[PDB]
Amino acid sequence: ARRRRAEVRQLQPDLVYGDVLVTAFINKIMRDGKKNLAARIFYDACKIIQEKTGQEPLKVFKQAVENVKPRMEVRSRRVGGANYQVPMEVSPRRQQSLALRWLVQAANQRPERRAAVRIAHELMDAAEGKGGAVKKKEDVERMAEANRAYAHYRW
Amino acid sequence: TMNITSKQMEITPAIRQHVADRLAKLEKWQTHLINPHIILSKEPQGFVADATINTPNGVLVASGKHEDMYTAINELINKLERQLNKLQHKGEARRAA
Amino acid sequence: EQYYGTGRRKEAVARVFLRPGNGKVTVNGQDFNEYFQGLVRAVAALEPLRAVDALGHFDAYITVRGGGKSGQIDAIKLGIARALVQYNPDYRAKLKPLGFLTRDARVVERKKYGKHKARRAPQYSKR
């Protein structure tokens, strides 16, 4: 806003891993304040990535998070009489937000029928290099490299 | 579509068609005239022709008065044209670096 | 012998009684895990003593009234954090920095006329 930079809310760590990042993902899953549902979907998914991939779910989750984080993005700025898609670096706060946002959104694009399944498989593919979530991070990075010429317009 | 209200006053369907034909001058600018609304009224000195129109580039609000109802209608369109032509061209001004 | 705190949150008031023992916890004539059965938020109601190691050291007698489950849960967190301080004054530090001692004032904001809720405003056509 106009007066001051806003203060980033601190999330409570989650009672099943102690992670604030795990909490943020739960919130992004949440619809209509149904946090009990939202928590159950992540933990249900956490078991599914255990059954299909024998290693730490938390490790799978945080690796997929790092994979979807966009390092550069384009942000429009009209110069004269043309809108120039300026390439800007993403602050760590915004990286996290976009990753968790794209993770869920790309997850709910899947064909699998149960939410916990869609959340599980997207995180497995994104722990690797696949998935529509990682595609978004890559597309955004590609479009920022596309416009490196306008990088002096940064603010 | 276009709506016409005759407040505390009765008008004919012919009068309503004249209004629609007169507002048709605004079609010149080839921009969407979104739910245009005209209000004809009667005051002790003359008629008042109000209008509210939204376009993709902004809104138009104008009021016309005159003893003759058609003149008040025409004065309204004149005030509405000057606003539309401002909405359609004001952005072109700050184009040169 | 017996230790007590008063816990409040939103519209829930929880009275908690700490007696030493193996760890059993009962809320309103039910076992803890039965009252909050299927609630993920429950375990946070025992966090103050996990912060001062009294996890299995106490039994818990707990009453509860008003509000809803999670409000009642957060009320417990304050209640048992209240009791551990009267149980030992030096328990404040390493419990107060964990925030567990403060009372959460965030409550339902009143509905105002002209709005649909506290702040949600009616839709209108400025056009």
Next chain:
Amino acid sequence: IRIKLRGFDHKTLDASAQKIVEAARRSGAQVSGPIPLPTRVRRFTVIRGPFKHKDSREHFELRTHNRLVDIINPNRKTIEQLMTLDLPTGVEIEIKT
């Protein structure tokens, strides 16, 4: 040996519950202190304006405050100076057993 007191203003209500507790207290013997029953609130919300302006209101309330007193050890000595009870106008007393 019960007395309950109802009034719209709580300042007179509490004073009129003290001058009963105080009364038969020293008059022998036991008086169970004035217990404030929860207040019944009767709400009134109206539009400030006489015509339209639906989104502007003013709230009024009419609170019916309540008090209970138990003159526990009666002794009809007390049941006399209570017959001449100088209570204000705003309060209403009920006597039951």
Next chain:
Amino acid sequence: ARKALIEKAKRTPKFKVRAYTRCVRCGRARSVYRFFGLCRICLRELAHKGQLPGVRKASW
């Protein structure tokens, strides 16, 4: 047509249903409270003057 209507509301009606409330202060037919017998406009007028026992502006 109001004065006759103010009198016809007092007159007990040929059927129990035809009975309706009016404002004992101004005759207003709509928004009549039964507790006071007043409309919303008179309710606020008397309350503001202090002539409604107990009634005060409520804020919370």
Next chain:
Amino acid sequence: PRSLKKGVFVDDHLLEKVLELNAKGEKRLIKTWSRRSTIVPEMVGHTIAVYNGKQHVPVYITENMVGHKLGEFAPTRTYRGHG
């Protein structure tokens, strides 16, 4: 519809002129404002004028229009379409 415990409602002032016509060798045309009255079988075969707010409409009662109200047959709104 009306409770079955209650009766089949007729305004009694309309029911009367039905039976006096029945018990004498009917019929005269009945004018009425009793739109609310049911068309009881004793009426079958008469022609009764129903007030719709403006006109008394001659409505010939037949056998298949009995469990009905008189208003249903003298409609109140004149409407012929638009344009």
Next chain:
Amino acid sequence: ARIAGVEIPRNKRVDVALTYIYGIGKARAKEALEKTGINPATRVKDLTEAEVVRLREYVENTWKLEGELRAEVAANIKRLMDIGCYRGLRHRRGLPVRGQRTRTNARTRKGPRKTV
């Protein structure tokens, strides 16, 4: 054309299937399977043929269905439209029948909007 003249879906439970019949809803699905003692959760592909005609028999003899029901509903709308009562007029014009406002909506009875 199994039961009753409607080839009800297999793959689905009996209570669910019998709803795919003009005249049989969720309510009458419970009534048919209790009165013939059939597990209401059995797929139509798994009904013993004894069960089928047992289910078929009760259904067709108890209730009016398909054509006879449809002819009757029409006959009632027809008689209302012939005896010239108010509801009949509403069926005459295709307007709504149960007192609803027509200044807006009523699109189910009127159909998609006709421009002017």
Next chain:
Amino acid sequence: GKGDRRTRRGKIWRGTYGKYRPR
């Protein structure tokens, strides 16, 4: 959903009772 009278949720929405929401 809430607009369906023949379900529990519909009778809750209307504030009524019956076979699909008993009392």
Next chain:
RNA sequence: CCGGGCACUCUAACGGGACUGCCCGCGAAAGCGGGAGGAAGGAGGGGACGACGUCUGGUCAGCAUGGCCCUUACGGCCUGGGCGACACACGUGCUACAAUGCCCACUACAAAGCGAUGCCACCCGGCAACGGGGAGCUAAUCGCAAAAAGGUGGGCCCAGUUCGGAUUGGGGUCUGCAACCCGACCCCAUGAAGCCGGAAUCGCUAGUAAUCGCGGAUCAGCCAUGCCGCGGUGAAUACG
């Protein structure tokens, strides 16, 4: 539940409490940033409260009131109709298009209010709306009352469907002198459009938005999906 008690919760009246008062630092000062203590920190959150004036703003139909106009009528009573019409058009909302869902059975956890031709426990009849009995409560006592989302278990398996519940046929209930126009509700059957919406556009910065139910005024009944309130669950983001 009784004995017992007012601890606790509470209820409701009166107090205390926060002042940049204390500390570090910048500053001429006013203040600003950070720290501790503290339930609360820099207006603690929300309310009530709206300057001289503006819109020849709104209301002669709430009321008042100048002036003009009507006087077997532009006054008054009634019955019936209309205010609910329907080729269309716009504004506000409700329910949705489904699996983070729908259905059934079982099991929790509120707040604020209302209630003596009122609120109705409990029993019986009816699939039910409801009806007949009948206790309690001038109500922190008796009652409306069950809160719902949630939790447990079971079904549905991606289909215009066990999504959605419009429309219509038929059968009833209740209020009311009277439910044709023109009431609400229940039951059987019917089971529409709708597969997330063009140009355009609204709200919201935290217990907020979103979502879930509860109450009241008006009120015989109700066309309330409205309005004024009440709590439950409970986010995202603010570089600028």
